[PDB]
Amino acid sequence: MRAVNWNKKEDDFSLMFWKQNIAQFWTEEEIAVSSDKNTWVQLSKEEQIAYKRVLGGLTLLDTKQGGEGMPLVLVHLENLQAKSVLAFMGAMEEVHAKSYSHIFTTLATEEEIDEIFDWVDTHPLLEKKAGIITSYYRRLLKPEVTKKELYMAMVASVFLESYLFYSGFFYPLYLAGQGKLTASGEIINLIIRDESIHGVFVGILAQQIFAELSAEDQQEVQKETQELLMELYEIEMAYTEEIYTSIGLVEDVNRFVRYNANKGLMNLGLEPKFEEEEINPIVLNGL
Amino acid sequence: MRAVNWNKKEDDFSLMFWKQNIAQFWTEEEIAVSSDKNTWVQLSKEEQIAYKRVLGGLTLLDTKQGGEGMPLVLVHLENLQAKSVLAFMGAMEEVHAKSYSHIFTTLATEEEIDEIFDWVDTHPLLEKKAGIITSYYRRLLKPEVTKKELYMAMVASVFLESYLFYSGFFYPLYLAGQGKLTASGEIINLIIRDESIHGVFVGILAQQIFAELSAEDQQEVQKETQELLMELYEIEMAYTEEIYTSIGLVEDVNRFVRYNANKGLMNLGLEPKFEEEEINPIVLNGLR
């Protein structure tokens, strides 16, 4: 049985991603967010509700990525150096998830926080979208998986980390770009700096597996990938309407969702499927 | 579907373990090992071989703990705060495994290193030992597990974390306790500082599951636990004989194995099974 041997490379990229993930290590104690209360009170009830809801959704996605997506993909990888990188990424997803609780502690009472999480648990679109992604992960709960099964779990993972988080990240960035909740925005930027490299790395691994598939299996997962992209897109458009109609941002968020879907496709080595639009300039200022 | 909510505790210990694991964070670039060359060359050929073999075995165990043990135990936990801790622990196992490569780069040529890893891969006792532990983890590759299956995977994990590593950790500590390979010894001490808290934490989780089992299931896993302890003990005694006979340390290491088996049992809330024997005094100095 093999032990990981970093003195013989298993691929051309795991070491650089290992070093970059480590170099980016952080925890929430590093960013105090009490100073955000001054701008929090300037928001309306509807703005505060939208913010709390989106962060709740992000927390759910990170919970599933650290607790199901990274563990189950990594268990079935044969490359021990790449597996090492995924294990570190999974730990960072738990740091990300916990960092949302650090923000909530400053912005909400204990009762308001347990309302957020009750709303998350019972929410039908979050249940549907998380269920679609984790169905691919839960297919890996068996002793031997096919490469198609592993590939599709990697596709689901890239779509979560490069695409599905963005209908939520939009709002903290948009507010930070307007000088509101800027300490929380710094946390979100640290999360995004990690997520960006997560989706690239998993996308590299997915492209490697794809090239190992038979032609018949390639055709199958190519079609399933495009269907999944658009199945998730329909749900995201329903989610954005629900979260953002009250604050007049639906179409803006939808543009941002499309921009990030294209990035997720590119991370998989696939062509964009939505028209190229430039990033909202307020969001850009928040980045 | 539930998201982790750290503003409502799911238990009385996950937050403290989370904070401690994070406070202990380290990577292999923090400890330069070049200066160990001056004592490395003073070791005999037999001593150098034993060191390299033990570190190769340790690498294998961490490789399996980070890549199977932590992921498969955590995926089936219902407690999202405890799952978070296990995910961080699994990442640290990868740091541990990689740190052995950093030591090897100083102590061995490229060809000698690839020989270490070939000896690990084809080694029958390492294969048997790791296979026994990972069989409990691989049982969890299914959508629905029983609490007996999850409990026994946690037992296997504690036995890896608190017991099986010690036939290998003995020798780096023994040399460091004599002023030899002290930089590598510092790394091993950082690893042990993590491993100790890993085994304590998983042992707490195992005790919680155990209390939910029926009395019949409790007596079944108690029997499996005692048998597994001794199945691993027989293999460890063969392993210590193979590794340490050339350098006269077999009985010392066996005493250390028994001491750490007792620690593993106590991490699970169980009584010791080996007579109390104080730790080798030089090993204790390598831990100081």
Ligand SMILES: [Fe+3]
């Ligand atoms: Fe994340």
Ligand SMILES: [Fe+3]
């Ligand atoms: Fe991520």
Ligand SMILES: [Fe+3]
């Ligand atoms: Fe370890």
Ligand SMILES: [Fe+3]
């Ligand atoms: Fe450990």
